Structures are given as C-alpha cells and as structure tokens.
C-alpha cells in the first residue's frame, strides 16, 4: 500500500543491454543516387543527431543512461545485381574542425567499415566513441562533437535503374569498450594506422599496368599546394626512420564483372613499367571470386633489409627514391563483358613489430597519393 519510495529501483545506474530488438536506438536512411561517383559524400553529420526523430526500443535508454558501457554497432543493408558494384565507407572520427576534408584518406583513420554492395548484402561493425576510455554516453558524444560520415569511395560500375537506399541500424551491444591510445615507444608490437594508400584504377585492355605506392608514408596525402593528414599518419611521422611487418587490406571496389589478376610485391622506384621480370621477386598473386571483395597482404620483416625514411623530400624523383614501394601489377589483363575499370582500394591497416628510429625534424609536404 504505502511504500518507502526511496527504496525502489529508480536509481538504476546500469548500461543498456538485451536482445538486438530491445537494444536498438535508431535507424538512418542514406540515399545512393543512381549516378553517385566516388568522393560523393552521402551523409555526414554528428553521430548524436542520428538519434533524432527516433522511436525504437532503446532510444530513451540511449539518451538517459549516464554511463553506457557497450559498443555501438552499425548494420548497413543494401545490395545490387551481380553485374554492378561500388564501394561505400561509413567512418567515425572524434571531431571535425573547419571546412574539413572528407576524402577517403582523411576519414578512415579512426573507425571505418568499408564494403562493396555487389559482393556483400549487409555489413556491420562495432565501435567505441570514446578512444581514451571504456565508456561513453549520449551527452558526451554530443557535446564533444563526434562525427559520422558515409561516402562513396568508388561509384557504380553499372548504374542501377533507380536511386538506391541503404538502411543503417544503430544498436548498443554487449561488447566491452576499449581505448586506442597512441604513445611514443620506439618499439610497439602493433601500431594501427589505417593509412589509405590509394585507389588503383586499371583500365580494361591488353596493356601493361604497374602501380607504385611508396612506403615512406610520412606527412600525408598530397593535395594542391597543401597536404591532408590524420592523427595516426601524423603520429608515425614523429619518427625519422621506421621498419616493421606491414599489413595491408585490398578491397575490390569494382563490379564483379570486371576481372584481372594483380600481383603484389615490394621493390624499388626505379623498375620500369616495361620491366618484364617482376615475378623474379618474392610476390603474391591476387584474383577475386565473384563474391569476394577483400584480401590481406602481409609483408614480413624479411622483405626489408633495413629501415627506411618515414618521409622523403617531395621533389624526390622515382629514380632517386631509395626507400621501398608496394607495387601492384597486372599479371594478365583487365577484362569484362561490361565497360568499367577494375578499381582496387588499398589500406595500410597497421604495422606489427613496429620500430621507430630517431626524431624526425620534418619535411613540409608529401607526394601525391
């Protein structure tokens, strides 16, 4: 009848949890025009705003729980016929300032999820919006301005007959939050970088294509009388020379109808595009099945004889660049019964057994990505 209200469980201070049904707080609709192009920013806004007109089971809980302990999980849904494809990317960054760059390179360093709707019919990932700790809250990510940007990293090889829509689902899951803090130890066993190496575009044809990506990754991605950088890339630039086991992620961003066999290897800038014996070096051969979109290259410490410069003078000619390069070469030829280039995305995920050597006084600028 009459109760001691002070005693009731009204001060329940726990994080949100439950089935995925009860644990969902918002959904988002992103429109992919039938002519999106790559560079195209599809949706860019503060993460918090994602929870606006929402009325799902965990919406109120997401907003009223002071300390949320689980991770955010995003699930994207969309899919196109097997003769088309493209590459989308959902990224999270702790903040934005000014008329910021929304290039793949700039946005993919912190937390990103990148897929090809022609190969995958949904894609999800979880993230901690507070890199320094193990908890966050709606008020915190709001006031601290956490950004959520979705871009077309590469457009449709063959346009769908209509504009397409991707549905984002935001839920809180019971995984634990963990910090991703960077420090100045010369040796670290895993330095996550997520440094974008570039978008390789190979035209269909009997021609011979060679792509050279420099491993002297200091500075950033080149731009017009400017350069773009992000925290992880800037961090590794602190070191004068570096070395380690490199881990790369290659994404098939073109439709599965465009086929080619690429071979990856490590060599120096001075080999010519016509060099006929690239396969006399240790190398890997990559081919993607229809449904496959990702590949992982690991170049061990036995592929590099010494450390190399973190950054080289911008005006350094290929013939004079004494640091190694990741080479992407077409083994046979690019083909397809449809028109389109064969586009690959390449990202240096991180370095295992990283070793930074000496302080880098710095060089202004960086070669073009």
């Amino acid at each position: 009848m009459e109760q001691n209200l002070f005693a009731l469980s009204l001060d329940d201070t726990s994080s949100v949890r439950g089935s995925l049904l009860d644990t969902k707080f918002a959904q988002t609709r992103v429109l992919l025009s039938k002519a999106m192009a790559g560079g195209d920013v599809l949706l860019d806004e503060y993460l918090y705003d994602v929870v606006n007109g929402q009325d799902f089971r965990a919406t109120v809980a997401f907003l009223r729980t002071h300390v949320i302990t689980g991770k955010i999980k995003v699930t994207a849904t969309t899919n196109i016929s097997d003769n088309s494809g493209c590459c989308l990317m959902l990224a999270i960054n702790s903040g934005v300032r000014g008329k910021y760059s929304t290039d793949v390179y700039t946005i993919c360093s912190q937390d990103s999820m990148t897929w090809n709707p022609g190969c995958k019919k949904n894609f999800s990932f979880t993230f901690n919006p507070n890199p320094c700790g193990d908890s966050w809250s709606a008020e915190m990510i709001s006031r601290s301005r956490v950004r959520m940007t979705v871009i077309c990293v590469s457009g449709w090889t063959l346009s769908p007959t209509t504009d397409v829509i991707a549905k984002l689902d935001w839920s809180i899951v019971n995984e634990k939050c963990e910090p991703t803090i960077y420090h100045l130890a010369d040796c670290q066993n895993w330095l996550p970088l997520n440094r974008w190496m570039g978008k390789l575009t190979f035209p269909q044809g009997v021609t011979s294509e060679v792509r050279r990506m420099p491993l002297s990754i200091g500075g950033g991605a080149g731009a017009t009388q400017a350069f773009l950088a992000n925290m992880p890339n800037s961090w590794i630039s602190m070191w004068r020379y570096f070395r380690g086991e490199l881990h790369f992620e290659v994404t098939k961003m073109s439709s599965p109808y465009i086929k080619a066999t690429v071979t990856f290897l490590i060599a120096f800038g001075n080999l010519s595009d016509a060099f006929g014996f690239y396969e006399s070096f240790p190398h890997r051969i990559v081919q993607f099945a229809e449904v496959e979109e990702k590949c992982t290259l690991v170049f061990s410490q036995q592929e590099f004889v010494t450390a190399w410069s973190t950054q080289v003078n911008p005006r350094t000619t290929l013939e004079a660049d004494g640091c190694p390069y990741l080479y992407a070469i077409i083994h046979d030829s690019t083909t397809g019964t449809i028109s389109g280039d064969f586009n690959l995305g390449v990202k240096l995920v991180g370095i295992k057994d990283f070793c930074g050597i000496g302080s880098n006084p710095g060089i202004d600028g960086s070669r073009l990505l």
């Binding site: 601290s144 630039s237 006084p361």
Partner: protein, 189 residues
C-alpha cells in the same frame, strides 16, 4: 657563468610572429594558441605571422584527445639596435583562456638586447582519462595560450615558438581537418 649549459633534443619550429613594420611603435602583443595552432595579434595586426607543419604541429592539429607534457622554447629575435639604446622588454603569459576572469598559469618577464631564449614546459591533463580535448564544450575543457607582449616593436622583431613532446605524451582520436597549406620555413636570409 660564462660557461653554457648543454642543450639537447630536437625541438621543431611551430609558429612565428613578427612585429608591425615601422613606423609602428606602441606596445603590442600577439597570442599563440599552442594547441590548436592559431596566431592572434591584438587588432593592430601586421604582425606578420606563420604556422609551420613540423610533425609535432600536425599531431597537435589532428589529435582529438591529448595527455602529456609539452616542452617549449621561445626564441626572441631583435632588430639591430646599439646595445646602449636598447629598452625592449617581452612579457610572456601562459594561460588556459583569454577571458579576463581567468588567471595566468605561468608568467615570464625577460629583457635583453637583441636576442633571448626562454624555456619552460607545461602539461596537458584532462577529464577523459587524463586526456583533454582542447576547448571541447564537453567538460568545459580548455586549451593553452601563450601571450607575448613586445614592449617596443621597433627593437623586438619576432617571436619564434619551438616545441617538443615529452616521451610521456599520448594522444587518442582523430579530428577531420581541412587540407594543410604548404608552409615552408621562412629562411634567416
């Protein structure tokens, strides 16, 4: 002490400001936002200024959360004045905010003919986990400002801010920034 104390480490040049050209001659000041990388003279600009892109400066401008110690060295270069006529003075103020209600965190007062060097360190420590997001509206966080007052802009020519991270520096999270303009170091001649 004629004998000089040995300096060491690599301190890279971050930002530099030069006093208003002749015949300007009132006491004037410029304030550096040591963390976000912004220079702001007092309104009587033509305090020709520059921000460089050494590694430390790019980490400072893209790193969302910071925690650690920063070692600074202020180099003061002066006009060529007979020592006997020198009257210049630089007043240095390190503070966390420019509102008049805030008090200085540290204050230096130098006055020597031609050139002078000032060394001090300070450390970033915030609410996130000893991490601080420069001026985030979040816990009403803050930044670190270095206000420099040139008492005679005709004798004191420019202020050069050199910085270096202590080994204990840590950083977390990234900030989407616009492209960084090339800004090669203006030579000494």
């Amino acid at each position: 002490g004629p004998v000089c104390a040995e300096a060491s480490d690599v301190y890279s040049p971050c930002m530099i400001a030069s006093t208003p050209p002749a015949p300007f001659s009132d006491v004037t000041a410029v304030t550096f936002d040591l963390i976000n990388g912004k220079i702001t003279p007092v309104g009587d600009d033509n305090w020709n200024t520059h921000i460089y892109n050494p590694p430390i400066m790019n980490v400072l401008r893209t790193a969302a959360w910071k925690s650690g110690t920063i070692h600074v060295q202020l180099n003061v270069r002066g006009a060529g004045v007979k020592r006997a006529d020198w009257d210049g003075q630089v007043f240095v103020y390190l503070r966390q905010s420019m509102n008049p209600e805030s008090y200085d965190a540290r204050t230096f007062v130098i006055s020597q003919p031609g050139s002078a060097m000032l060394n001090f360190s300070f450390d970033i420590i915030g609410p996130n986990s000893g991490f601080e997001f420069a001026e985030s509206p979040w816990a009403n966080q803050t930044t670190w400002y270095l206000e420099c007052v040139a008492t005679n802009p005709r004798q004191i020519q420019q202020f050069e801010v050199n910085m270096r991270f202590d080994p204990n520096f840590r950083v977390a999270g990234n900030i989407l920034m616009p492209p960084f303009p090339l800004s090669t170091e203006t030579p000494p001649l």
